[PDB]
Amino acid sequence: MRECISIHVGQAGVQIGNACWELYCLEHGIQPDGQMPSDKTIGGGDDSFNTFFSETGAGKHVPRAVFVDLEPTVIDEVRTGTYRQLFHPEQLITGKEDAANNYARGHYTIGKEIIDLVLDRIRKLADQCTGLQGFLVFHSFGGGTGSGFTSLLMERLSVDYGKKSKLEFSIYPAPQVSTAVVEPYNSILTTHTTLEHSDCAFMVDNEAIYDICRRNLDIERPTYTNLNRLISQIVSSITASLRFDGALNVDLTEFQTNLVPYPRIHFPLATYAPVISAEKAYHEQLSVAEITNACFEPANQMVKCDPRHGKYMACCLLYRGDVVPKDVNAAIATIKTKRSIQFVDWCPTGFKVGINYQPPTVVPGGDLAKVQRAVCMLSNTTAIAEAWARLDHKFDLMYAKRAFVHWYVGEGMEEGEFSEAREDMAALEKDYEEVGV
């Protein structure tokens, strides 16, 4: 059995990592004091859930987590929160002054001064795991610590844990909920540096999750607390294979060989369904062909794009709940006819499927309804580049005037990293296009 370490960077990471660990603890029956009555292997075990939890002699189940934020605002709410006892104190790390939405501030200025601390905190968790698989990193493209520190940290792990896998859960910036005007800058700089150090990265475009919340959850103005609970719902099925007994996606490295045939193109598209409201009473329960079909509607994806105008390279289907392979196949066969499912020729036109019977778990009094069967489709389609286009455009409008560049150069960064980082992006958009036409 092989352990993984989650790393949550900035407000975005910390607040989504809270969202996940709460759902993990409900899924595995671990109460906020870390006592898991179901565990008879008190204090240890090579069990599946020990991938994410270690046990104490007192029988506590403790996240293999680490929360880092350059300001003590968010991780303080973790430090006093309903799940305080879960995390030992050294897992939660705060600075005194954030990166002010500045990649250069969090990377170079404030980042050179906490980077050594964090890596030792991280080194602690590795020394308690019998074989380290790798890291699940949570952060936002738009934050300054979200973006600056993460990519300084991603580099160091590639040096201090080179033989390990590094997965990424990134919150792609969108302006309804955006707080900063430079997020397209922070996005390109941090992507250019992390691209070589991440083995698979799932983008959650916040614009997408927001409309999913408004429309299907009947939430007038969705909050972060609304968004994250939906995200971990996605984040839970995506990682459920590691935490649970199973046969598909049993280690971080399999994510690289199911979804990522070429290395730079490692941004699978998550599509999750059904997001049904808890308020809505008398809800018809959706069949395997209904929800699997929904994976191909654009309004259930985490990034808004059109896979019809793209080529597939890989496709997994993660069901959760009452689902039998029979129904999965019938749904697939008929979906093949009615949809524009185009793979690249050098790849087989097949679907890797997983079924976990523990039906979806929902936080009590949350907004998501309790459903009998759920699915999450993870598809590496070339159409996700629409996102890199839109991001790169916003980047070009501002950069052409050099607007705000002075805030970056004043931290020590040179105008060059901007163009060098955009150059990479331009190269990435071309890989996506050559593979897709």
Partner: protein, 298 residues
Amino acid sequence: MYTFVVRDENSSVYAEVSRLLLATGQWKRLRKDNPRFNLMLGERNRLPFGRLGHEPGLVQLVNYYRGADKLCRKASLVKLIKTSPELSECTWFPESYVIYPTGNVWIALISSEASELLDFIDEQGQVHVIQKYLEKPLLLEPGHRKFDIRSWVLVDHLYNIYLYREGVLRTSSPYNSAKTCHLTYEEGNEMFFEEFNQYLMDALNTTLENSILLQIKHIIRSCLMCIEPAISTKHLHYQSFQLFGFDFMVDEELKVWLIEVNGAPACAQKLYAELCQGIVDVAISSVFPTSIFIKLHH
């Protein structure tokens, strides 16, 4: 007071559409590069669909259907008509062969000698396609002349297919089985559906409806329903319509054949203001608020 930009200055058609929109006193034009538009009269190639429908509190519409190029590219049309099962290997498309540079008359460019054809394309360097020439077409008397039919077809945001009931023919003022009077009385070398129907009645004992337009409608309907799932914008985050021009050829005994689908068409001058009006009523204001169209029900 909806907003719209303009990014195809050569568009004969939407020129009028952009004009009218302003004169309604409720539409305004922004500059090319403003994102805050309700309408995009877009460029012809590389029209940036990946960036539409993303501006919050802004319903966005564009005048192109992403992927329509499947139906409007000479090489790409035969691909669609032969592969997708709905278009069978079909009784209204001339036999075509696509070819890459790297009675048996045919056209690309026309001759009965095969090698005249192959030498022609490979001496260019791009891919063309060759297709049986309609040896016995319907020569409009008096003149023993060749012509083609273009109906313009408008497709709205919810994939209603509207046929413009004004057609037009291009004539060829002396067909002979010898670029002279074989590749397209009536001013403009152009005849209109009223006169042709009239001639259809006096020369042949028929009418435009029964003898030609039935199958034209069976085509215009058959083609846009095939690609409907690949280009539909029913559940999309932006929305599209696209005015089309289907180019038809009617052979000796009143057989309608589809020839080209032009996805950036220009309209005959006589009908411009009429056609460009129904565009605004039908495909623009039906989002942002008798008929000159035949709804082709599917």
